[PDB]
Every structure is written in C-alpha cells, then in structure tokens.
Design a protein around this motif. Sequence first.
Motif, PDB file in Angstrom:
ATOM      1  N   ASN A 255      44.569  48.309  46.393  1.00  0.00           N
ATOM      2  CA  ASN A 255      44.918  47.785  47.936  1.00  0.00           C
ATOM      3  C   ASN A 255      43.883  48.059  48.519  1.00  0.00           C
ATOM      4  N   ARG A 256      42.667  49.385  47.812  1.00  0.00           N
ATOM      5  CA  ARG A 256      41.591  49.944  48.766  1.00  0.00           C
ATOM      6  C   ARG A 256      40.692  49.907  48.440  1.00  0.00           C
ATOM      7  N   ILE A 257      39.665  50.840  48.460  1.00  0.00           N
ATOM      8  CA  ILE A 257      38.330  50.723  48.493  1.00  0.00           C
ATOM      9  C   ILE A 257      38.041  49.766  46.555  1.00  0.00           C
ATOM     10  N   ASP A 258      38.976  50.596  45.869  1.00  0.00           N
ATOM     11  CA  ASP A 258      38.635  50.449  44.549  1.00  0.00           C
ATOM     12  C   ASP A 258      38.797  48.984  44.472  1.00  0.00           C
ATOM     13  N   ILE A 259      39.050  48.223  45.079  1.00  0.00           N
ATOM     14  CA  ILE A 259      38.527  47.071  45.550  1.00  0.00           C
ATOM     15  C   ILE A 259      37.253  46.724  44.981  1.00  0.00           C
ATOM     16  N   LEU A 260      36.387  47.568  46.027  1.00  0.00           N
ATOM     17  CA  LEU A 260      35.049  47.572  45.723  1.00  0.00           C
ATOM     18  C   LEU A 260      34.654  47.975  44.916  1.00  0.00           C
ATOM     19  N   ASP A 261      35.231  48.988  44.247  1.00  0.00           N
ATOM     20  CA  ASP A 261      34.743  49.548  42.931  1.00  0.00           C
ATOM     21  C   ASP A 261      35.168  49.054  41.786  1.00  0.00           C
ATOM     22  N   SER A 262      35.952  48.180  41.686  1.00  0.00           N
ATOM     23  CA  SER A 262      35.890  46.545  41.292  1.00  0.00           C
ATOM     24  C   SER A 262      35.033  45.799  41.525  1.00  0.00           C
ATOM     25  N   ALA A 263      34.572  45.356  42.409  1.00  0.00           N
ATOM     26  CA  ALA A 263      33.168  44.764  42.544  1.00  0.00           C
ATOM     27  C   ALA A 263      32.035  45.628  41.875  1.00  0.00           C
ATOM     28  N   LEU A 264      32.345  46.860  42.045  1.00  0.00           N
ATOM     29  CA  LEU A 264      31.317  47.204  41.292  1.00  0.00           C
ATOM     30  C   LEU A 264      31.263  47.140  39.607  1.00  0.00           C
ATOM     31  N   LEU A 265      32.486  47.429  39.037  1.00  0.00           N
ATOM     32  CA  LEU A 265      32.321  47.183  38.214  1.00  0.00           C
ATOM     33  C   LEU A 265      32.300  45.665  37.713  1.00  0.00           C
ATOM     34  N   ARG A 266      32.703  45.053  38.373  1.00  0.00           N
ATOM     35  CA  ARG A 266      32.301  43.553  38.101  1.00  0.00           C
ATOM     36  C   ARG A 266      31.663  43.202  39.175  1.00  0.00           C
ATOM     37  N   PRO A 267      30.571  42.438  39.308  1.00  0.00           N
ATOM     38  CA  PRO A 267      29.041  42.053  39.758  1.00  0.00           C
ATOM     39  C   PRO A 267      29.186  41.081  39.739  1.00  0.00           C
ATOM     40  N   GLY A 268      30.030  40.018  39.278  1.00  0.00           N
ATOM     41  CA  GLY A 268      30.700  38.711  40.213  1.00  0.00           C
ATOM     42  C   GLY A 268      29.829  38.028  38.359  1.00  0.00           C
ATOM     43  N   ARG A 269      30.743  38.448  37.443  1.00  0.00           N
ATOM     44  CA  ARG A 269      30.342  37.793  36.208  1.00  0.00           C
ATOM     45  C   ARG A 269      31.030  36.542  35.992  1.00  0.00           C
ATOM     46  N   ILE A 270      32.787  37.628  35.448  1.00  0.00           N
ATOM     47  CA  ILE A 270      33.978  36.691  35.460  1.00  0.00           C
ATOM     48  C   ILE A 270      35.049  37.318  35.956  1.00  0.00           C
ATOM     49  N   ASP A 271      35.469  36.376  37.243  1.00  0.00           N
ATOM     50  CA  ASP A 271      36.633  36.806  38.322  1.00  0.00           C
ATOM     51  C   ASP A 271      36.877  35.890  38.432  1.00  0.00           C
ATOM     52  N   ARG A 272      37.946  35.419  39.467  1.00  0.00           N
ATOM     53  CA  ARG A 272      38.315  34.404  40.931  1.00  0.00           C
ATOM     54  C   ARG A 272      37.965  35.599  41.489  1.00  0.00           C
TER      55      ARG A 272
END
Lengths: 162, 279, 33, 57, 49, 280, 378, 300
Positions: free
Chosen positions: H202-219
């Motif tokens: 629900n928070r910034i850790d979504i953008l942290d997940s975007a740092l951990l997942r640089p648009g490779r395998i995700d929907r």
Amino acid sequence: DRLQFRQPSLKRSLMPYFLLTQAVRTGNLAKFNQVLDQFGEKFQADGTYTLIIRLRHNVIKTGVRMISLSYSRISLADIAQKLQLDSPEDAEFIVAKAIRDGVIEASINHEKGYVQSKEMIDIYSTREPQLAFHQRISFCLDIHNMSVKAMRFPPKSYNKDL
Amino acid sequence: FLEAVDQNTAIVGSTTGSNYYVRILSTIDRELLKPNASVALHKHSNALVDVLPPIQKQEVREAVELPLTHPPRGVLMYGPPGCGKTMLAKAVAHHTTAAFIRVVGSEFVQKYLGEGPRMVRDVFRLAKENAPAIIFIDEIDAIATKRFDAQTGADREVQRILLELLNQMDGFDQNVNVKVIMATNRADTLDPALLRPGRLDRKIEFPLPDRRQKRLIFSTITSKMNLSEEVDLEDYVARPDKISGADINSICQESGMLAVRENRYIVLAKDFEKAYKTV
Amino acid sequence: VWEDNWDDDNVEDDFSNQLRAELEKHGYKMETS
Amino acid sequence: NYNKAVEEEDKMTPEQLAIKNVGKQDPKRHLEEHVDVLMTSNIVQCLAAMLDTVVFK
Amino acid sequence: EEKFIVKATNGPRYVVGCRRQLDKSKLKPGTRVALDMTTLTIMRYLPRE
Amino acid sequence: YQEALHLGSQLLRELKKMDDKALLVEVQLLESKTYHALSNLPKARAALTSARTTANAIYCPPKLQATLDMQSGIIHAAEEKDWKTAYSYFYEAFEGYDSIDSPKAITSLKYMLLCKIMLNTPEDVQALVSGKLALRYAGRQTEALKCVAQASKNRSLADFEKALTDYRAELRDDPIISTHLAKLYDNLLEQNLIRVIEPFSRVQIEHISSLIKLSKADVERKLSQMILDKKFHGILDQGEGVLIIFDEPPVDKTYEAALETIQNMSKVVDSLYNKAKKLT
Amino acid sequence: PKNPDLRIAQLRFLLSLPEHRGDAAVRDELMAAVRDNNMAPYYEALCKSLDWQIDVDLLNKMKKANEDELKRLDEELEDAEKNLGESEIRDAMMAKAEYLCRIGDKEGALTAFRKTYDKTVALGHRLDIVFYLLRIGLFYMDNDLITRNTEKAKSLIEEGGDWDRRNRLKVYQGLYCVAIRDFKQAAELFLDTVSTFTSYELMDYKTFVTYTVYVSMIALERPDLREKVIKGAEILEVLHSLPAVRQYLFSLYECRYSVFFQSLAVVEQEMKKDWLFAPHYRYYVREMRIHAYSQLLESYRSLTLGYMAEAFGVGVEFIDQELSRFIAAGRLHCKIDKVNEIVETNRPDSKNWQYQETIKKGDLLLNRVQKLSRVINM
Amino acid sequence: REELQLLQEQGSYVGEVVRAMDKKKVLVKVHPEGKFVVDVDKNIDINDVTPNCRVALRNDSYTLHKILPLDKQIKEIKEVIELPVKHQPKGVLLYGPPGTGKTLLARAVAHHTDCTFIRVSGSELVQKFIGEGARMVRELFVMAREHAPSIIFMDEIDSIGSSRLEGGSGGDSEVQRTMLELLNQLDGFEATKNIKVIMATNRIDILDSALLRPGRIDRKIEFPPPNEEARLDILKIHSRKMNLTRGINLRKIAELMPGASGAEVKGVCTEAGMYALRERRVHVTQEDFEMAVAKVMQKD
C-alpha cells in the motif's frame, strides 16, 4: 355431493338432479312432491319410476332418520308441525321403535294433553363409568393383546431360519 | 479424563496426577468419552458410572438493542478525557434483560498458552449457547501490541488468540446470538485489522476539551440556567486559553454547588471567579 | 382441504334453495319479529 | 416425560434408519428401558385386583 | 439434596451420602463437615475459625 | 394523525441534518403526543429516546423540557409498569410548570394526583390538597379528584359513579386517561366482586346485588367477560341464577398422553412407509 | 404483473357477475385499456363487455403497437446477445417477459421466464422470477403452478430474510392461505405487518389490512386477539382510517349483538364481490356465527329466551332452528333443554371428555395396527 | 463379573518406555517414585515395543498390553488467471486503498475457478505442520505440486505500517526476498501449471518493488482511487453484498465520491444501510447513497 372431482360433465349431468338430491335432506313432502313432477323429465323418465316412486315414500324415512341423528324427544306442535305430521299415534309409535333399538333412550308424558319429556340424554360421563367402558377396556386390551401376539410371533418367524 | 486410545478402552488421570489405564464399562455409551470431562471412578473398583457437569446513548441504544431482537455488532468508543465505559455498560445492563460478560481485556493472559483458547472458547460457547450475552471487552490496547521476539511469546500467542477470535467473529458475522461490544481509551496503538470496516461498524465519538465544543457547551450551559447582563464570556473563554483544564461542565456544576446555598437568586461573576479560585 | 367442503357444501347447498344469505333480511325482521 | 424425551429422538431415527441401514453407532437400545417403564407401570394393573379384594371382602 | 461432593484436606475429593440422624440444616454447602473412614458417613460438622 | 405523523417523520429525516437542532424538540414532542394519541408505546419510547438524546445537549427553555417529562410519565403510565418513576417524571414536570401557567399547573397537579391515585394512596392526595402551596391552584378540577380519592379511601362504588355522574359536565373533556379511570373503576369492581362472591358458593343475585344497589346488566357483562378471560373458576346463570365453581387439577395427564399419541402416530406411519417402500 | 393492470383487469369478477356495479368497472377498464397493453385481456373477456362497434377501432392500433414493441424487444435482445455479459441478457429477456406479462400471454412468458429462470446467476434473482410468476398467478388463479416454484425455491436461501422480500413472500403466503381455508397456520403470517409498506404491485396496505381483518377477527379467539392485535399498536394506529372496523372489533369483543346484527349487512355485502375473497364468503358467516354462539354460550350455562331474544334482537322462531341445526350439524355443545322454554346445557366436555379426546386416535390407531397385522406375511 | 477382579485390581498405571535393553528386561519410565524395570509378558514381543512411547502397564503384574499413541478488473484478470485454466504471467499486484478488491477479488476469481486458496501466514503452526526446517519456499511448492490449482496472495504483511524505510526495508525484504526466490523458482522451472503469486503493498514499498522488479516479469493492473471506473467496478463489488435495485445508475453516484481513498465507498455503504433500514426499505437506493455521500463528505 361432488367434492373432489372437478370436471364439466358430472355438473351438467347432475344439474336436474341437484335441487332434489339436496332437497332430500330437508324432506318437504307437499312442496317437493310438486317440484319433482314439475320439471322432472329424465330422472323420472328413466323407466318404470320404481326407485323414485319408492323415494317419494322414503322421504319420511330419511326425515325420521335425520330426526334420529337429531334430537331424540319429540314434541306435539313444534317438531310435529315442522315435520308436516301432526299425529301423536305414529309419532310415539316410531319413537318407541327407536327406543327399543337400544342406541338411545326417551320417555313419554301426558299432563294436560301435550307430550312432555325430561330430554336428559346426558352421556355416561360420571354415570356408571365402570359398567360403561368396562367392555371397552376388556375389548381394547384383547385386540391390543392379540396385537402384542402379532408383534411377538413375527420375530419368531424371523429367527426361525437363523 | 485425559485421552481415548481406542473403543471401549481409554486412560484416566487420577487426582494425585498419576494417569490410570482402566477399561471402561460396556453400559456407558460414547457420550461420556469427552476429553475434557469430569469423570468419576470408584474408590476400589475404579469404574466410571456418570460424569459430573462442570447521540452517544442513541447510537449505543439503536446499535445494541435493535440488532439484538431484529445488524452490525460493535460500539467501539474513544476519548481519553472522559471516564465513560460505565454509564453505557450499566445502561445496557439495566435496560435490556439478558446476559452480560464483562471482563478486563487481559483476562486471557496466563502462564499456560493452551488455556487461552479453552477460556475464550468456553466464554464464547456459553455466549452462543446459554443466552445472547453481550460481551464487554474493555481496554484492548494492552492486547493490541504486536511483537516479533520469542522471549515474550506469550503476548504474541494471546494476540494470535485475538486473531483466532477475529476469525471467529467473521464466522459470527450473520445469524449469531451474541453481541460483542468493545471500549478503549487509545486508538493510535490499535492495529488496523481490528478497526477494519465490517467488524466494528460504529465509531461513536464524544465531545472534547476542544474550544469549539467548550464554547458550544458554555452557550448551551447558560441557555438553561438563569443569566444576567453582568455575566461575560469573553474573559471566561480567554482565561481558559492561558490556564487549560478539563471537564469544565463539572466546574460549572461546582459553581451550582456554590450558588445553591439559597443565598442569591441569580448567580453572578462572584461565584464564577470564586469557583475558579477554589475549584 | 376437501374435508371442510362437506359442511360448507352441506350448509351452502342446504341454503341454495331459499334463505341463502338471510343477513339482509334481519334488518327488516327486527321491527316485525 | 422420559418417554417423550426418547420419542423426540425416535422421530429422528427413521431418517438414519431410512438412509444407511448398515451398522449400529448408538450404543443405546431404546427398548429394554421402555420395557422397564412398562414393568413399573404394571403395578397399577397388579394392584387393581388387590383393591378389588380389599373392597370386595 | 441427599448426596453431595466433599473436598478432603489431603487433596483428593470424594462423595458421601446422608445419615438418617442428621438433617438438611447443616447439610447446606459452605460449611466444613467431618467424615468417617468406614462407609464415609457424616457424624457432625466442623465450625471454621 | 396519520399523514401528520408520516409527513412530520419524513420532515425529520431531512431536518436532523439541518443546523439548529433545538427546533426538532417541538416536532418530536408532538411526535410523541401523536404516538400516544395512536396508542403506540414502543415507537413513542424510541422517538422519546431521540428527544432525550436531542435535549441532553440542547437546553431550550423549560416550556419544552417539562413537557418531555410529563409525556414520559404518561407513556410509562399507559402500560402501568412502575408508578414511582412516572410519579417522579410528573413531579419534575410540575416543578417545570410551576408558576408559569394556571391551566398547565392545575393539570400538572391533576396528573400528579392521577398517577398517584392509580396506586391506591389517598393519604398523599389529602397531604397535597391540605397544603397551602397547592391550595391557591385549587378549583373545579381538583374536586373530582377529591371525590375519586374519597371513593377510594371509603371503598365505595355508587359514590364513584356519583363522581362520574355529577362531574361529567368537568369529566367530559377528560383526556385519554379515561381508559385508566375505567380501569380503576373496574379494579375496585373486581375487588368487590371477588370480595362478596368468593364466600358465596350459590346465592341469590338480588341478595348479593342489593348491597351494591346496581343493575345486573353491567355487572353481569363484566362478570361474564372475566369468566371468558379465564382468570378464576365460575360461571353465571340467567334463568335460575345458580353459581357453580369447579376445577380440573389433573391437567398434565391428557397433555402428555395426547402428545404421546400424536408423536406415535408419526412413528406408525413412518413404519408403514418403510414397509410400504421395502415391499412395493 | 406489478402494474395497475393487475387490479384493473382484476375487477373483471365484479364486472362479470353483478350488473349494477358493471358500469364503473367497464369505465376504468375501457378507459385504462389503453394502458399496459390491455388488448388481449379485455379481448378474451369481451363476452362480458359491450358490442363490437367501438371494439374494432383500437384493435388495429394495439395489434401493430404490440408488434412494434415486440420487434423492438427482439432487436434489443439480438443486440444484447453474442456479447460478454449476464445482467444485460437477463434484463433483455426479463423485460420481454414483463411485456409478455403486460399483454397477458403465458406461453412466450413461460418460455421466457424459463430461459431467464435457467440463467439465474443467484438464488435471489431466481426468487424474484418466482415472484414474477406469482404476480400473474394471482390473476390466473392457478393452484399448483404457484406452489411448485415456491416449494422448490423456498428452501436453500442461506442469505437471510430481507425487509420486503421475505415479507413479500409472507404476503403471498397470506394470499394463498386466505384463498384456502387454512386458518390455524395463517393466523401467524400477518404478525410481521410492522415491516409492510404501501405496495402498489399486488395489494395496497389498506386492502391488506381490510383482507386480514377477517381472518384475524374470525380465525382468532379472545386471548389470541388480546395478545396479538389488542396488545399490538398496529390496529390501534390503523383503526382511524375506517371507523367501522373499530365498531366491528369493539362490538365483537364487547359482545354487543344489537349493533353487530344491524351493521353486519355491511360485512355481508362487502364480503362478496371480491376476486379471491368472494367464493369463501359462506365459511366466514357460519364460522363467525358459531364462534359468537360458542363465545356467549361458553360463559353461560343456562339461558332464558328473554335475555337471549333481547340481547340478539331477533325472534325466537329463528334461533330455535339455528340452535336446532347447530347442535347436530355444528356440534358445539351437548343436548339443549326446552322444558321451561329456557336454553339449559351441561357441557361435560372437560372431566371425562378431556381424557376421551384420545379415543379417536385409539380407534384409528387400532385400525392402523390392524393394517399392521395385514402387512404380516403379505 | 470375571472382570470384577480386574476392577478390584485398583486400576493400572500408564507406562512410558524410554530405553530397551538387550537382556529382555526393558526399563519403563513411570510416575515419580516408580521407574520399575521388568520383563514384559510372554504373549507380547519385545522388539515391537519402541522406546520414547507410552504404553499400558499394570500396577501389580507389570506386564505390557499394547502400544499407545470488478468487471473492469475481472475483464483484465481473466487473461492472467483464467488463461492457464480455460484459454505465462509470473505475478500481478494491485496497490491502492485497502478497502476492498485485494482479497475478495482473489477469493472471488479463485472461487469461480474452483481452486484452493493458500496464504503465507507467517507465524507458528505453519512452520511445523509443513516440514520441520527448510528455506520455507520449496515445501509450499510441493504442496502446490500435490494441489496444482492454487492462488498465492500476501495479506498479513499488507499494511501501512511499513513506511520507515530503515527497518521495514529488511523486515519487508524478508517476504520480498521470499517472493524473489519464489519468482526465481517459477521463472526457473515448473512441474505443473496453475502456480501463481499475487503481490500486495500500500505504500512506497510498491516503488521499492519496482526497483526490485525493473519491468521484467510482472503484470500491472493498477487500482487508482481518483479514477471513475475504478469506483464503478468496486461499487459493483459493494453492490453484490447488499440488496440493490435494477433501476439505479452507477455513473454519477460512482463519480460523486472523491477525496481520501476508496474506503470512503465502504463508509457510504456501511453508513447507508442504517438509512436503508431507517427508511424501512428492502434495498438501498441512489438517493440513499447520495445522502450517505453527504454524511461521509461533510466530516472532511
């Protein structure tokens, strides 16, 4: 009458016989005697008019039977005039024939000319009960007892093979 | 009785603590095989015969007594300045004639971690089976503190029991004969899983030391009683900004207790400043 | 329920010839009887 | 009251007896207890003749 | 009302009956009583202090 | 009173959100008045509770505050649950209507003597009509209350009918509490009837109706109504006037037996369903 | 359907049999015939209507408007088909079925409500379809078709009783329970009248109270009224609508036959000329007369002809045959006494008969265990 | 009556064998003041009696007897979840207001798919029932191999409390690393299908997940609270629970709920049912939802 059957055949077939087959219960002699032959075509033209010519004299027997299921004691004016029969002879005679049957009881009285009656037809409640339902207890225990035999023997017919 | 190993044979714990292995009697059916039951053997034969048997008042009123007979459950309150928690618990306890289970929020914090579900399961089973008991759980802030370490595992265990009843109320959302009312003094330390919508649908709020409700309560507190032209509210609202205090209505009631001596018909600033300097 | 149709047909059919309703006649029979 | 307290379950017995018909799970017989109730009830019948003898002679 | 549960001082609990001499006055709970080794009969009670 | 209560309620649905909630006290007070006019106690308790939670923070002049306590005492006095609390509400209502209006004061003390005369204590009525405080508000209204209290302390009935006969020209404008007054009349009537009939197993109707010197029409209708209510054992008579009292103690026999027969009929029928299913 | 055409088309009973009131019913029937596509109902019931002079005038417009709306609903149904969606097709076929209920054709509405009956995503919508079959089943006065969908859709609710859905099904229970002569189980249905509201779909609130006041006033005794309706504020609030009901309630509960027989003609005339309440008008009369005779005769052992004739305000020659027919036919009390022209009964129905109430189950149970003996060996 | 002497036996004890001896004399650990070593009865073998288990031992004979023991979102999620079912995406996340749509969507689509739902639920009673000790990511994949249809979703960690970025980076990075190695297994190899994971933050850790997942395998299926259709679909979810009429328009009533977040709709419904029952209706109407919108927007 027609209660559990709903079909538009027995209605039209029963329309001419309906008014009279309901008129039997009340048992009016003079009026219904003219009502029958008034419009009566088929049920009296069925042939030889035997059962209906016996019914014309059976109206008084079904009426006096309706009196048997009705009050027991007979009056001199109210019910005698109501039944279109003012005759203290056959009234007390038929009522006596109903007393000798054993299913009911009645009495006769004559003080000033009118027929009086105590009309005490109170049931056997608090009136000799032991003699009243004694045979009811013996008979019910005999039938229920042979029913106990009828629930003891079938188990024998069950364990007979094993 | 401790455990049942198979049919027609089980073990039984004696009073002295030693477990006994005695074959049960064939006449006793399987109903007496309850694990947590009060079995009684003989003194010599050691055979068992039978077991022994072990807006606030409007929102609270319409939120409690209307869903009980006719339905959200939970009337969680707030407000540290006022005491509360007694006039409404006793108000419902006297208006409605039903069962009431009032327990301190730390009633299931013991030395045995297994006794928790037994205690809350017994209270919940007598609240669901005995009568529509309105359970009053007060001061959940002590049991609403999360923890991760294993040294204080008892608090994490009893908050796992708090999650167990948090799921049992989800099972008790519809068509249950129980009411779970709750009271607390601090909502900041409460986890969002308890205040989630659909569980406590009533957020009843009381007035506060805030100056808006103090001015409104001064106007409504001087509307009823008799007033005079000498009574001024500008200094009596600016001075509380310098010296802050609570329960000002109780101070006005004290002024009534100082002007109730039947000496003066109309209260003036003399008893106001006198009540300010005395109480 | 066809059990009640015996009494309802007994009194209803019994009154089909004459004095079917008889409730409207009591208002005229109060002063005359 | 105990007879009705057993008949309230005897009303539910023909369902299970009308579904499974295989095996017995309830250790209760529900028969010898009612027979004992009849034995306690036969005291009225056995003593009725006693009252008949005391009243008679 | 005739048979109740007793709690011994040693720790194990038992159950006793009612003696034909005593009555239901002192038989009410909350009063310390006395028992016998044979048949666990009740002779008299024991007032606390 | 239907469209006024419905339109007023729908007006409250859109006025509870509007500011200046002090105006709602009048329409909620009239709401309780028309709920009492329609003889509806639960909704008068809910709307009355709304008037309490509305007037708890609102402190309007006592013109509306005392009427809430008076109407509350009337609502509690309609069911006759507790006369002490209702008497307290009429007491505070009388404290609110003190020296502000003569008719409101005489009807306030009239309501006090009413709710207090319903509990059969005329001594406090004499204590309130003997004091100099309430003496200045006395008049033609309190005279009928003095006659009711006198008929209550004297345990008389024809005197109470005289109070209901001579003073009916101030009892004609009597409020809905007239049903409660008829309940007190029927209460003393019940006391006398269970007083003189109870020792008389079979007695003449004129020998027992002579002391009360009243007709047998109303007494016969009330008696027959009370036997039809099945509150005691008795039956009336017109031709002979014979009074017979009897009872049937063994009630728990035919009920349990009938329950055994009805419950066992389903057993035998279910048995015939199992056999009829297994055979054909 | 739920439109007023159910009531306007429901007045055909009083439009058909009586010739006096057949003017207003044909007035609002002919005037309201241009509403809700009333062509087929009055065209089928045209035998009880006027001549064919003005009849063939509007038929040419209604027969083409029916085809226009029908083909527009078919075009909307084809536009909603072959697309991803559930509520759209259910609203198209459901609306087509509603129009087919407006015209009064249960064939296309039978297969339509069968298709949308099979496309029910939830059980609540299925019960809504059941109600859509009940609103027309009241007009068709069918017996089994209205009990099959409610018997099958009654169980397996699992969503709890709503405020007006389950209460509406309770109103339907009042309908088919007032149609049938079952009263001992129908006296509990109208207990939830507090949650009822003005429902123009089937019956108005005043018509629901007017219809339940008969089954409640007759089918209940004095303790049942004192507990249910007299203690409740419902009749206390709704008595102000019509002052007559208060007279028929306080007069019956007060046992005043002098006004009850003088004002009973309004109950006799108003009892008939109704859609569903007319064919049973004979049972309420006899049942209410024997109920009043058992009420007054219950607390009275002996009764002279003077107090009875003056109390009821009728001649002795009529109550003579009344009691004469109600002792044997009605079977209300024991033998009557007439030695001194004073009705004197005993009624020993408590002491011995209270124990003799089981002899009927003993004889029928005796024949049933004789049948049990017949099952033996065969 | 033959057993009456065994009733006179004063009962029997409960033995617990802890060590077996090779001299046919097995010692049994009993109640304190016990520890009675004795040979078992002749009719019972010795090798079958395993140590560290409780048995039945008599008090006098000392013989052993036996051993004792969202149309706008389902229209998009059908091609993600429903693609391996009736028609591969490694994961999907939905971040926004935690009112509704995070669990009712996973359990709703997982309920229409007739598949089980498995949670992480990091606590006791799950680290012992499923394996004794491991990396805590392969045993759940073995249970996902025995039960191929399954929907994994993070629900317990989804909270606004993880907003410090100092301790929440590691504490949150435990489950973020858990799903990192889980997506490394799913990306590495698969034995069966229907194995998917769903993220929730629900928070910034979504953008942290975007740092951990640089648009490779995700929907990416985003649920914004300002959007309108994101209030139409979630308002339909709010309408599937309580009774709603068919002649209602969700467009404007779904557009007149701006401000804080999507839980304001839950305030409209929960604060609206009291006006639905207060108005004595069977279903909530659009005017009721409007008055509830006023009652929840006047406090802001």
